[PDB]
Amino acid sequence: VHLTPEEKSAVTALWGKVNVDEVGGEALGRLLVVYPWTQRFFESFGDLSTPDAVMGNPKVKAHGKKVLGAFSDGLAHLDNLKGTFATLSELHCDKLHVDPENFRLLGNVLVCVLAHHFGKEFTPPVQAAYQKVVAGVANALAHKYH
Amino acid sequence: VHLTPEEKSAVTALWGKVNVDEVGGEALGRLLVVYPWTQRFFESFGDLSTPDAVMGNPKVKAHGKKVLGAFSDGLAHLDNLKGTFATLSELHCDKLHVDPENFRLLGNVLVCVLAHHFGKEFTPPVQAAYQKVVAGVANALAHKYH
Amino acid sequence: MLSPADKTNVKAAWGKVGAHAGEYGAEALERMFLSFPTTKTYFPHFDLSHGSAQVKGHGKKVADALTNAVAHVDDMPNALSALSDLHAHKLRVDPVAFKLLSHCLLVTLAAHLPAEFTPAVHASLDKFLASVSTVLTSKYR
Amino acid sequence: MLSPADKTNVKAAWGKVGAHAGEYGAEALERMFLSFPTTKTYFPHFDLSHGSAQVKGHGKKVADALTNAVAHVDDMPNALSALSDLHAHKLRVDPVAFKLLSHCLLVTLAAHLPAEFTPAVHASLDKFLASVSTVLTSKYR
Ligand code: HEM
Ligand code: HEM
Ligand code: HEM
Ligand code: HEM
């Protein structure tokens, strides 16, 4: 999306240091604990009664990796989030019945997790470039809903 | 604004029956009464303590006609809302300091007002087309914010 | 927080709906589904075509609950407790969706009450629907 | 509503905030202004550049009202009555903007309190900021 070059490169460089497995595991898990109603799509993951259980759930952890995996491949197509995520958008609407407001919740969780992990390095200007990316990603994922 | 030509004709057709001066005053008045925090922008308009004070206020009425006259002109340019509203966008941001969430609140109130005026004529699909229009107009008015 | 005046305006407006509640509930639902298609993700098991019977049936159920809240406007958290458990623990609808339905019920009411949908009343009904939404969402976490 | 676990979680995290509260308040504002530029519409009278004194000063005021809320966590409406009056009748800030500041505060805490910002504490802080926000918008209409 409307991303400044100095912005574009702030994102990219930061992402190069991200452990996608850990981070995805943590974003998704935080999502299920901070906003419990999102657990409605995960009944078959198992016990999700307590934060600990949610955070130790291998299917959560594994699903977290998949999601962020797909997100990660997206930061390489910033000039075209819509095309990259179109099939995903359809599947989310037509097979999975996921309200896109959930994509926004995850993005905000994602931004808290990046801050948790990188501390001082996650500066306000670096946070701004990520907020653009995350909203851009959410909007791409909601694009094919009818 | 992605609008179907059947949507576009539904919208333009209804709009042809609108008395903009009156609907404009009603929409603005109801905005100020239903969402009283929005009065913050209108201290110079005098008395706004009761609904009749607001609805009959000659300044609210004049200002309403002016808002809607400009919304109208925008309905003749659905393919270039951004362009049409560029200067007004700048003006609302740098001189008036109006938070864009106000354009969306006003949008929703306009839709109930049209609903009030046209009754059954305001069909579910006709409403759906107006919802896209007010959203697009609100995004065009926010687009030069920085 | 509803005021005496709000409570009066709401009872007066809902009194006029009367035995129209269900009808207007279905209509509200149909407006929402067309205006805000993402809300369809909550009823994947329904048939959402115009005049659909599951939509009518659900519309009546929604309108009955609103009718009950009006009948119990000074005790809404308790009158709506069961419904509130259901939404928080089973249906888990995202909170923003309540705002969408609320707008649509308001549109539906406006289209049917040309005489009673005054600014004062519109205001009161908007606060009323936000209080109902707050109650139904109060046990989410 | 905040549970006992929540109050405790909140008091503990804000416990380690200690004397950086003012610095974190300021940081959160700066984060909000940059990420959500529309929020600048509420501070046309301020110099909003990096490290300006109006932001700092303001940051300390906000942080201090949060200190006061946590300490009166059992009695917020009363503890924040005056601030509630102030926002509803004078500042008249749009309710949606409270969500933005809250998110920026949360990011600010996650950035400065790594060991403390566990998934449970994150949940509680979010509920708390929401409760505060509700209280600050409870008299709007
Ligand atoms: C950052 C935005 C997101 C991205 C990029 C993403 C990506 C993906 C991908 C790649 C899959 C695998 C589909 C396949 O089998 O090929 C998937 C599945 C799924 N996603 Fe998303 N996802 C996102 C957010 C969400 C969130 C917010 C929710 C709900 C809380 C959600 C719910 C699901 C569900 C329920 C599945 C199917 C899981 C299963 O097979 O059991 N997703 N997602
Ligand atoms: C459809 C959305 C809107 C449109 C098309 C619109 C259009 C206009 C126009 C044409 C003007 C006159 C410009 C000038 O004086 O040079 C104006 C001024 C103004 N607008 Fe907007 N307006 C919109 C919404 C709003 C709303 C929602 C608010 C606040 C709730 C607002 C606040 C103002 C204020 C305070 C003025 C200046 C009043 C004065 O002259 O003292 N506007 N707008
Ligand atoms: C004005 C606010 C609302 C009220 C008063 C309300 C009331 C009700 C009632 C009475 C039921 C029936 C439960 C039973 O079987 O006894 C129900 C179920 C349901 N509601 Fe809510 N509702 C509201 C808003 C929402 C909205 C916003 C959503 C999502 C957009 C929603 C989604 C659902 C779903 C999916 C069911 C189950 C449908 C079925 O499978 O039969 N409701 N609601
Ligand atoms: C976490 C919720 C918030 C709390 C606790 C809070 C607290 C405060 C406090 C303590 C003051 C100072 C009052 C005084 O000087 O006596 C204040 C003023 C103010 N706040 Fe709120 N605030 C919150 C959110 C917001 C929101 C989100 C905004 C707008 C985006 C906002 C805009 C303002 C403005 C413009 C002032 C006046 C500043 C000045 O003119 O010096 N506040 N707030």
Query: Is C1 in contact with A58 (CB distance < 8 Å)?
Result: no
Contact A111 D107 (CB under 8 A): yes
Method: X-ray
D88 CB near a chain B CB, below 8 Å?
yes
- A131 half-sphere exposure, CB direction, 13 A CA radius: 20
Start-to-end C-alpha separation, chain B: 22
Query: Is A110 in contact with A27 (CB distance < 8 Å)?
Result: yes
Report which DSSP code applies to D87.
Answer: I
Contact B124 C123 (CB under 8 A): no
Is any ligand 3 atom within 6 A of the Cβ of residue C84?
no
Can you tell me the distance from the alpha carbon of C133 to that of C126, in angstroms, rounded to the nearest whole number?
Answer: 11
φ, ψ for residue C20, nearest 5 deg: -135, -5
Can you tell me the distance from the alpha carbon of B38 to that of B25, in angstroms, rounded to the nearest whole number?
Answer: 15
Report which DSSP code applies to B61.
Answer: H
Can you tell me the distance from the alpha carbon of A107 to that of A126, in angstroms, rounded to the nearest whole number?
Answer: 15
Q: Is the Cα dihedral A76, A79, A81, A84 positive or negative?
A: negative
Is any ligand 4 atom within 6 A of the Cβ of residue D101?
yes
C119-to-B23, C12, C139, C140 alpha-carbon distances in Å? 13, 14, 32, 32
Read off the amino acid at residue A135: A
Task: Cite the DSSP H helix spans in chain B.
Answer: 5-16, 20-34, 51-56, 58-75, 81-91, 101-118, 124-141
Query: Is D33 in contact with D50 (CB distance < 8 Å)?
Result: no
Contacts of A93 in chain C (CB under 8 A): 41
φ, ψ for residue B110, nearest 5 deg: -65, -40
For C73-135, the DSSP string reads: TTSHHHHTHHHHHHIIIII---THHHHHHHHHHHHHHHHH-TTT--HHHHHHHHHHHHHHHHH
Chain C, residues 90-119, CB within 8 A of chain B, namely: 103, 106-108, 110-112, 114, 117-119
Structural domains of chain B ordered from first start: 1-146 (1.10.490.10)
- CA of C30 from ligand 2 middle (Å) equals 33
* Resolution of the experimental model, in Å, one decimal: 2.2
For D42-59, the DSSP string reads: G-TTS--STT-HHHHHHH
Residue among C122, C98, C94 at smallest CA distance from C108: C122
Minimal C-alpha gap between C108 and chain A (Å): 22
Burial class (CB in 10 A: 0-12, 13-18, 19+), B33: buried
Residue among C98, C36, C35 at smallest CA distance from C66: C98
Query: Is A114 in contact with A107 (CB distance < 8 Å)?
Result: no
Query: Is D69 in contact with D79 (CB distance < 8 Å)?
Result: yes
- Tokens at residue A120, please? 């001082």
Can you tell me the distance from the alpha carbon of B81 to that of B72, in angstroms, rounded to the nearest whole number?
Answer: 11
Start-to-end C-alpha separation, chain D: 22
Is any ligand 3 atom within 6 A of the Cβ of residue C39?
yes
**Alpha-carbon torsion angle C105, C106, C112, C118, nearest 10:** 160
Structural domains of chain D ordered from first start: 1-141 (1.10.490.10)
Query: Is C136 in contact with C79 (CB distance < 8 Å)?
Result: no
Task: Cite the DSSP H helix spans in chain D.
Answer: 4-17, 21-35, 53-71, 76-79, 81-86, 96-112, 119-137
Can you tell me the distance from the alpha carbon of D11 to that of D5, in angstroms, rounded to the nearest whole number?
Answer: 10
Can you tell me the distance from the alpha carbon of C69 to that of C57, in angstroms, rounded to the nearest whole number?
Answer: 19
Alpha carbon B82 to its chain's center:
16
Query: Is C117 in contact with B116 (CB distance < 8 Å)?
Result: yes
The set of residues, in sequence order, having a beta carbon less than 8 Å from that of C71 and lying 6+ positions away, is C79
The set of residues, in sequence order, having a beta carbon less than 8 Å from that of D42 and lying 6+ positions away, is B97, B99, D91, D93, D97
A127-to-A14, A40, D36 alpha-carbon distances in Å? 11, 29, 11
Can you tell me the distance from the alpha carbon of B145 to that of D34, in angstroms, rounded to the nearest whole number?
Answer: 12
